[PDB]
RNA sequence: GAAAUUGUUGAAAGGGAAGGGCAUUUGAUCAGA
RNA sequence: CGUGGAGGUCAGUGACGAAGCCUAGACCGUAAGGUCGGGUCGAACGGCCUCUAGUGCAGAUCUUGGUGGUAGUAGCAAAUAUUCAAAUGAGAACUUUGAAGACUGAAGUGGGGAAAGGUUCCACGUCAACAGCAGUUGGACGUGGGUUAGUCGAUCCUAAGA
RNA sequence: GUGAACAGCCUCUAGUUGAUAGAAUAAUGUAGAUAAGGGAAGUCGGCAAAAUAGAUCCGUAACUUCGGGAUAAGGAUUGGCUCUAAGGGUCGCGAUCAACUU
RNA sequence: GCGUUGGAUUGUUCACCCACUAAUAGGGAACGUGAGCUGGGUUUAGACCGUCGUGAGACAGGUUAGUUUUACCCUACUGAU
RNA sequence: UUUGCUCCACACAAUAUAGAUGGAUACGAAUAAGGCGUCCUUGUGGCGUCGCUGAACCAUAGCAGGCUAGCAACGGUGCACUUGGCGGAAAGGCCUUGGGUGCUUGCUGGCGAAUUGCAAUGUCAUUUUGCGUGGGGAUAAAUCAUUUGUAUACGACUUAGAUGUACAACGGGGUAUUGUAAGCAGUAGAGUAGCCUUGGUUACGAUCUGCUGAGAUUAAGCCUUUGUUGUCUGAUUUGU
């Protein structure tokens, strides 16, 4: 008989299976549609989630109860040092989909990216790309032949880039290598851009700008095996329930005489690939710019790094992307920031945000001070120093 | 790594015992001290002086000190079997406080 | 010193049972003349 | 067709190997079955004519015994709690000694008894089985030792009752 | 020792340190806890839990078989320290001795 | 395609009313769903009442109390090698 | 690697065969329309012709195809070289230059075949593997163990580790939590008890005050580090 009281199902069947992602770096499964009139540019970027903080800004939203008023907003900081271009892949269209025709690599690959090709780097003889780099012996005839093939074919061009983890506080030391689609016309010009940028760095400001809507693609934080109550949000069973209450009472009707795929079951929670869209960039800050965390309203000469450092991450010393709100993945995780797949004109996008103040109080507690100078000014002289 | 040598260390038993069950804290301290001596001397055969066991258990099963100053001496042994011809002996140092002390080579005994 | 059941060795087959019937291929094995 | 036993017969087979058993080896019979070879084995047994029956199994939640898959699985999680060193030993988380940390907390995890048990007491030797891990230890195993009354009990008295 | 207490908690004498262990710290459990705001809307039903709780002082209704109801209900106080006062024995007002309770 | 509720009374399905709501549609799945729960009801044994029966006892009448066992196998499902 | 691996050529051994036995012989579109040829005024053009199936086209004779002698013509075809071009949908094929070599049944001769006994597939293809002989080529990793916690029930994941912006253990600094440590001192302290230079002293005293936002703790899943000390070649396995 019927359910006797209607209620929406628990969870989204489109995010199935709730299994562990096959990689710690979530795949970009779609790049922006290519507009072959614009200049050649990366469609995405690689960064590392540093942490969260809060900003204050005046809201520019006519008709709102908070128009021209100050609002406090959570922001996520993504450490984004320049990525190194080390390769270029050509993709030909086939009746079976896109197929990589060939890949041309840079002549010199740094140990950062060479470590990606090894499970035991320290005891290896580090032979990776040693025979390939000889293809640049005298004139690079083989390299130019492969690039000519990419131009003659390969309706889609993607560059191979890798992060510079040595510039992050992470202990990993093994770089993240990814394909980023080159948008901007003239497949020939895409290949020329890739070849010229071989062994060269691309900074995050050449890809993203202030107020832009971007998408964050990352593997969520892992939580291991989870019961249905927190994995799917099902109702806790009553206290009187024998055999436990963090369960789904009826996992199926008599017929079909099978548990169905749509029934909440205990299993892995977290560590899933997610692609969350429409996160507005609030800052495109630069590592070389001391007073990274300053605004035109604050002027306090401070970097984005909170007092004591980003908890479990470290200090931001590179270029960084501050997006509004939160993004999937935990701190220290590699994230991919990609340009929006559509042209959003909604007055939520297209809003020009100007930060008034960025919180740099310690996130290791109820941080009361923005700067060590401010802590000294409030507390006066202490016994050890100050 | 294959010679006789004595050094004084400080072990952060606080961070090694963080969150440990109360009935297992002192036994866990014993095992962490064995692991500590194994890490620092390379010896699987680690022996603890009964005075060191007293120092560990001084405040019962849960009241292990945050820091202990240990004298670890890697020495050689010759017995029925080779069985790791080197072994470590761990003794307490009996200092007033075990704070602000660096690893030092004893150089005398 | 049987069978159930089991180890080893050897032979063979094995996409959600296995086993069976008719027929032949292939491998192994063998009587009759 | 086959089985146990019986009368007759083949002056049947057999320690130079009877019977039994094993044998994707051979032959006969539509079949019940029969025959042969090879291995194993060790003391009896068979063909035919008849006699006779406690004479043929897939079952009966059959009977007795044996054995699986389950499965190296469920589990060995109440009674706060163990640790260091030495000795012994082939072997030590578990034995002994020392050290330390704990508990029972005198309505005891202490010291005795009644019922019951019956040697479990104690020593020496000792670990195949038992102590649902272990074991060099034990209420185990083997061998011994040990219970001393005029006064403590029984014994005597009567009780309900017999 | 605390305390009204053979309660609970800690200790002395005595005894024991015996419960298979080691390593991790997923879900679901068993046992023990906590929780913003709401406060039984949950549920057959306040089941479970929470709240109350000792002692001193105040105050205590209906009803009643006049005995109770009654710890009704409902209030207040409680540590530590330094003091003050009162409460006894024996000997010949004095001398001396002594323990707690308020 | 999408949603179709919070409550008072009743074990209740049903019913009824309060109220919110865009709406408070109807149904199935062994009258879905007890090795998922719960056990208020029904539905053993205790007990009370009314009627009936000479009686033992009866009542699709009322009332009160009344043990809800097992997954470690196979598949299915969820995750994992 | 107790001579390992790979490629090519040859030979020899195996191994099988979803099934060779002359050739899978390439426009596109329409079908109430087309193909081909040709012409021009180049089109949705005129004229001619074809279909009515591949019943075609090509190939096809020679001891399973031998050995030879000529003629004719500079064709056809095989091979290994070679010139250049095109082909990415799974290209791995298509076309083209030049010379060399063999065959040529286009035509005409000479020799051979037997006895496989009147048939017996009467063995002629290609699939993988191994080995040996030569030539050519290259000179790693992965796993276990240790380690990290962005992971995690176990597996799995993600990190690090052979001399360095290396890693670790400590120590230092930052951050953070609590809330002012111990010790010493005080002409602080309700008072009580003594003492005598009766205007002060001694003893006890919760507490108060100062040194003292001090002291303690702080990564165990915080940040950082010109410091101290140490570590850095164990095991197993993998070949086209
Ligand atoms: Mg419905
Ligand atoms: Mg949520
Ligand atoms: Mg229950
Ligand atoms: Mg924080
Ligand atoms: Mg914890
Ligand atoms: Mg026998
Ligand atoms: Mg058998
Ligand atoms: Mg008989
Ligand atoms: Mg015989
Ligand atoms: Mg057989
Ligand atoms: Mg005999
Ligand atoms: Mg019978
Ligand atoms: Mg039978
Ligand atoms: Mg039958
Ligand atoms: Mg049976
Ligand atoms: Mg049986
Ligand atoms: Mg188990
Ligand atoms: Mg249990
Ligand atoms: Mg226990
Ligand atoms: Mg002992
Ligand atoms: Mg107790
Ligand atoms: Mg106690
Ligand atoms: Mg004894
Ligand atoms: Mg045992
Ligand atoms: Mg044993
Ligand atoms: Mg012995
Ligand atoms: Mg005995
Ligand atoms: Mg007497
Ligand atoms: Mg008292
Ligand atoms: Mg609450
Ligand atoms: Mg509250
Ligand atoms: Mg209230
Ligand atoms: Mg209610
Ligand atoms: Mg309700
Ligand atoms: Mg109700
Ligand atoms: Mg209750
Ligand atoms: Mg009261
Ligand atoms: Mg009352
Ligand atoms: Mg039903
Ligand atoms: Mg069911
Ligand atoms: Mg049930
Ligand atoms: Mg039911
Ligand atoms: Mg009931
Ligand atoms: Mg009844
Ligand atoms: Mg009557």
UniProtKB/Swiss-Prot annotation, chain A:
Signal peptide stretch: none
Modified residues (Pros-methylhistidine): 242
Main localisation: cytoplasm
PTM (free text): Methylation at His-242 by HPM1 is required for proper 60S subunit assembly and promotes translational elongation fidelity.
Phenotype on disruption: A mutant confers resistance to trichodermin, a trichotecene toxin produced by plant-pathogenic fungi.
Gene Ontology CC terms: cytoplasm; cytosol; cytosolic large ribosomal subunit
The entry's keywords: Cytoplasm, Isopeptide bond, Methylation, Phosphoprotein, Ribonucleoprotein, Ribosomal protein, Ubl conjugation
GO molecular function, a single term: RNA binding
Keyword Phosphoprotein annotated: yes
Record's miscellaneous remark: Present with 450 molecules/cell in log phase SD medium.
Protein name, as recorded: Large ribosomal subunit protein uL3
Organism of origin: Saccharomyces cerevisiae (strain ATCC 204508 / S288c) (Baker's yeast)
Record lineage: Eukaryota, Fungi, Dikarya, Ascomycota, Saccharomycotina
From Swiss-Prot, chain B:
SMART domains: Ribosomal_L31e
GO cellular component: cytosol; cytosolic large ribosomal subunit
Signal peptide: none
One GO term of the biological process aspect: cytoplasmic translation
Intracellular or extracellular location(s): Cytoplasm
Transmembrane portions of the chain: none
Keyword field: Cytoplasm, Ribonucleoprotein, Ribosomal protein
Gene3D superfamilies on file: 3.10.440.10
A Pfam family it matches: Ribosomal_L31e
Molecular-function annotations in GO: structural constituent of ribosome
UniProt keyword Amino-acid biosynthesis present: no
InterPro entries: Ribosomal_eL31, Ribosomal_eL31_CS, Ribosomal_eL31_dom_sf
Domain of life: Eukaryota
Sequence similarity: Belongs to the eukaryotic ribosomal protein eL31 family.
Function according to Swiss-Prot or TrEMBL: Component of the ribosome, a large ribonucleoprotein complex responsible for the synthesis of proteins in the cell. The small ribosomal subunit (SSU) binds messenger RNAs (mRNAs) and translates the encoded message by selecting cognate aminoacyl-transfer RNA (tRNA) molecules. The large subunit (LSU) contains the ribosomal catalytic site termed the peptidyl transferase center (PTC), which catalyzes the formation of peptide bonds, thereby polymerizing the amino acids delivered by tRNAs into a polypeptide chain.
Subunit structure of this chain's protein: Component of the large ribosomal subunit (LSU). Mature yeast ribosomes consist of a small (40S) and a large (60S) subunit. The 40S small subunit contains 1 molecule of ribosomal RNA (18S rRNA) and 33 different proteins (encoded by 57 genes). The large 60S subunit contains 3 rRNA molecules (25S, 5.8S and 5S rRNA) and 46 different proteins (encoded by 81 genes).
Note: There are 2 genes for eL31 in yeast.
Protein name: Large ribosomal subunit protein eL31A
Organism: Saccharomyces cerevisiae (strain ATCC 204508 / S288c)
């Amino acid at each position: 008989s019927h359910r006797k009281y209607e209620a929406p199902r628990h969870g989204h069947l489109g995010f199935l299976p709730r299994k562990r992602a096959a990689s710690i770096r979530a795949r970009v499964k779609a790049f922006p549609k290519d507009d072959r009139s614009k200049p050649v540019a990366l469609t995405s970027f690689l960064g590392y989630k540093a942490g969260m903080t809060t900003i204050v800004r005046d809201l520019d939203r006519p008709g709102s109860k908070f128009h021209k008023r100050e609002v406090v907003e959570a922001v996520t900081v993504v450490d984004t040092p320049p990525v190194v271009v080390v390769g270029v892949v050509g993709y030909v269209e086939t009746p079976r989909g896109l197929r990589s025709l060939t890949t041309v690599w840079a002549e010199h690959l740094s140990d950062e990216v060479k470590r990606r090709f090894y499970k035991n780097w320290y005891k290896s003889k580090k032979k990776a790309f040693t025979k390939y780099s000889a293809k640049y012996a005298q004139d690079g005839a083989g390299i130019e032949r492969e690039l000519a093939r990419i131009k003659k074919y390969a309706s889609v061009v993607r560059v191979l880039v890798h992060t510079q983890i040595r510039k992050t506080p992470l202990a990993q030391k093994k770089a993240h290598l990814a394909e980023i689609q080159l948008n901007g016309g003239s497949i020939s010009e895409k290949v020329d851009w890739a070849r010229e940028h071989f062994e060269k760095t691309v900074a995050v400001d050449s890809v993203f700008e202030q107020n832009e809507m971007i998408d964050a693609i990352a593997v969520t934080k892992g939580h291991g095996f989870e019961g249905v109550t927190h994995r799917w949000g099902t109702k806790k069973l009553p206290r009187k329930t024998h055999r436990g209450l963090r369960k789904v009472a009826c996992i199926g009707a008599w017929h079909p005489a099978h548990v169905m795929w749509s029934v909440a079951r205990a299993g892995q929670r977290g560590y899933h690939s997610r692609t969350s869209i429409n996160h507005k960039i609030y800052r495109v800050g630069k590592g070389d710019d001391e007073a990274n965390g300053a605004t035109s309203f604050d002027r306090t000469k401070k970097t984005i790094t909170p007092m004591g450092g980003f908890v479990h991450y470290g200090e931001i010393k590179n270029d960084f992307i501050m997006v509004k709100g939160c993004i999937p993945g935990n701190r220290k995780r590699i994230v991919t920031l990609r340009k929006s797949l559509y042209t959003n004109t909604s007055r939520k996008a297209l809003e020009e945000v100007s930060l008034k103040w960025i919180d740099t109080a310690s996130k290791f507690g109820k941080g009361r001070f923005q700067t060590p100078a401010e802590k000294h000014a409030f507390m006066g002289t202490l016994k050890k120093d100050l | 790594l294959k010679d006789v040598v004595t050094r004084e260390y400080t072990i952060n038993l606080h961070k090694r015992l963080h969150g440990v069950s109360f009935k297992k804290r002192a036994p866990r301290a014993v095992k962490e001290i064995k692991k500590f001596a194994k890490l620092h001397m390379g010896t699987d055969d680690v022996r603890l002086a009964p005075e060191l066991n007293q120092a560990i258990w001084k405040r019962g099963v849960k009241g292990v000190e945050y820091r202990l100053r240990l004298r670890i001496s890697r020495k050689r042994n010759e017995e029925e079997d080779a069985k790791n011809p080197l072994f470590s002996y761990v003794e307490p140092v009996l200092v007033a406080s075990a704070k602000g002390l660096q690893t030092v080579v004893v150089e005398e005994d």
